[PDB]
Amino acid sequence: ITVIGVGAVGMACAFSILNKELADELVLIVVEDKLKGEMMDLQQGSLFLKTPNIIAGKDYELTANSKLVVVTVVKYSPDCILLIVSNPVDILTYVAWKLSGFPRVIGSGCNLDSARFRYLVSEMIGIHPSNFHGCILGEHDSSVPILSGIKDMCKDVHKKVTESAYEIIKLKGYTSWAIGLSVDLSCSLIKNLRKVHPVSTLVKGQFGIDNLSVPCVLGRNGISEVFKPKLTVEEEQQLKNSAE
Amino acid sequence: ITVIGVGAVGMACAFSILNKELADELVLIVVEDKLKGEMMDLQQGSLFLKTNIIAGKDYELTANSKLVVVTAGAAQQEGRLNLVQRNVNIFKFIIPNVVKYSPDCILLIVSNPVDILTYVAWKLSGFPLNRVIGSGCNSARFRYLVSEMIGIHPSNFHGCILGEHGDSSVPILSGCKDVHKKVTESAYEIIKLKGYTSWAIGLSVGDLSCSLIKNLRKVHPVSTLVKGQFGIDNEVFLSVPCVLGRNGISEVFKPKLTVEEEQQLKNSAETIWNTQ
């Protein structure tokens, strides 16, 4: 597994993927000094993880046949699953798809948003979060609650999931831990779980759209299948809108 | 945590509670040789489990258990409601000796038929309803079967089975009718290929003892009072979705089903009543 960009995200993705014991080999990929210092800080806690190979560098060649490449490449891993994380995701998931030529190109989307959005709702109801099911489609403020899975009530909970990330950046400057965890996705991909996550891909032809995060089944081949739901007129109408 | 009955069910149950590190103490309860022999087999494997296992017959050993799982059952023979009363007779000896020593415990009824034998326990213990639960329809296999028809993980499929843990159960298709029967039939076929169900119901009791011991506030279709629901008026117990925490059932759900679905839960209720 490869993870490019050792910003606070790349490390919380790298540190979370490592706690999941997902890779036999983790590659961190332009600031040479920084990269080697992080690699050796991980390598020093190898006992407390299950990954005997952690190596960083500036040479993409180290990204050789790397089944998963988390982006926070084609040349050396022409077969890899691309997983984009860089913030303006839905757009940059278009970008990558068009740069790589790959068929294996996924963006974090609203996996994390729908993740907290769930926690909060169950938190209010007093139900274990695993037993409440409900998602957020659309772009990672324009997120679109699929209430069909009180109008002003659920919008309110959603409101708190929008202002959240924003207010986080004011205080911190970036989300590091929150998106490291949700990157959950590496888990399902590697282990071929065929689980369903709201992730960003092409939705042209859905919701009348002719030019985002939809529920997709994830496995060792990436998205094996995309859902084409028949949602409510407004929900669907706000899909065109979030697209816009 | 106390298990009562060290037959195959209780031992599969026992082995699941130890496998989930829910128990820091575990009691097992008529044949001594089996009791010790079962207690020594587990203890001989301790390094591979957290724990402090103690078996015996004296119910004094159960004193102050927090959860008590009851598996004490009896076997059919060549020659359905006599059984239902034998076990009731078994419960007239078990439940009083449980409450005599752990009155604030959580009773978990796994012995069959549960729905009825969950009403028996409540009626014998005089416990509040929240501390008297039945393994019920804890659905998992229904969800699994469906979740493979669709090529998706079963944690991203959601649906449940309510009513009698039996042929009367209802699939709540509001949140496939074949897959329901395939489950019930498979329960029957297991009981006569094998003599009983154990592995499966053990995994399930684990699921439930986990929610409860750890206060996960998790939702489980389990047998409790539903008098006042679905046009029901008899103190009948059935599997509805309930919220399980460190105080047994904290809240029972009041679901809103299609008309067909609500007439079937009355049937399922009617069918249990006729024996009860």
Fold classified for A110-244: L-2-Hydroxyisocaproate Dehydrogenase; Chain A, domain 2 (3.90.110)
CA distances from A235 to A111, A239, B99, B121, B178 (A): 18, 6, 54, 49, 33
List A107's β-bridge partners, or say none. A84, A200
Catalytic residues of A: 140
Numbered ranges of CATH 3.90.110.10 in chain B: 137-276
Q: Cβ–Cβ of A131/B218 closer than 8 Å?
A: yes
Domain A1-109 grouped into CATH 3.40.50.720? yes
Q: Cβ–Cβ of A130/B243 closer than 8 Å?
A: no
- Specified resolution (Å): 2.9
Whether B6 and B27 have beta carbons less than 8 Å apart is answered as no
Using the CB atoms, write b or e for A16-46: b if 16+ within 10 Å: bbbebebbeebbbbeeeeebeebbeebeeee
Q: Which of residues 180-199 of B touch A (CB under 8 A)?
A: none
Picking from A128, A188, A195, the nearest residue to B216 by CB comes out as A128
- Minimal CA separation from A126 to chain B, in Å: 7
Helix (H) or strand (E) holding B19: helix B8-19
For chain B, first and last CA: distance in Å? 29
CATH class of the region B137-276: alpha beta
Residue A75 contacts by C-beta under 8 Å, 6 or more apart in sequence? Answer: A60
Picking from A128, A194, A217, the nearest residue to B217 by CB comes out as A128
Picking from A127, A133, A217, the nearest residue to B152 by CB comes out as A217
Using the CB atoms, write b or e for A56-91: b if 16+ within 10 Å: beeebebbeebebbbbbbbebbeebbbbbbbbebbe
Whether A128 and B218 have beta carbons less than 8 Å apart is answered as yes
Structural method: X-ray
CA distances from B188 to B7, B127, B181, B185, B195 (A): 19, 32, 10, 5, 10
For residue A131, the chain B residues in CB contact (below 8 A) are 218-219
Q: Is A52 on the interface with B (CB under 8 A)?
A: no
Numbered ranges of CATH 3.40.50.720 in chain B: 1-136
Candidates A123, A192, A194, A225, partner chain B, best to mutate (most B CBs within 10 A)? A194
Numbered ranges of CATH 3.40.50.720 in chain A: 1-109
Q: Which amino acid is at B169?
A: S
B234 phi, psi to nearest 5 deg = -100, 145
List A225's β-bridge partners, or say none. A217
Just give the CATH number of B1-136: 3.40.50.720
Numbered ranges of CATH 3.90.110.10 in chain A: 110-244
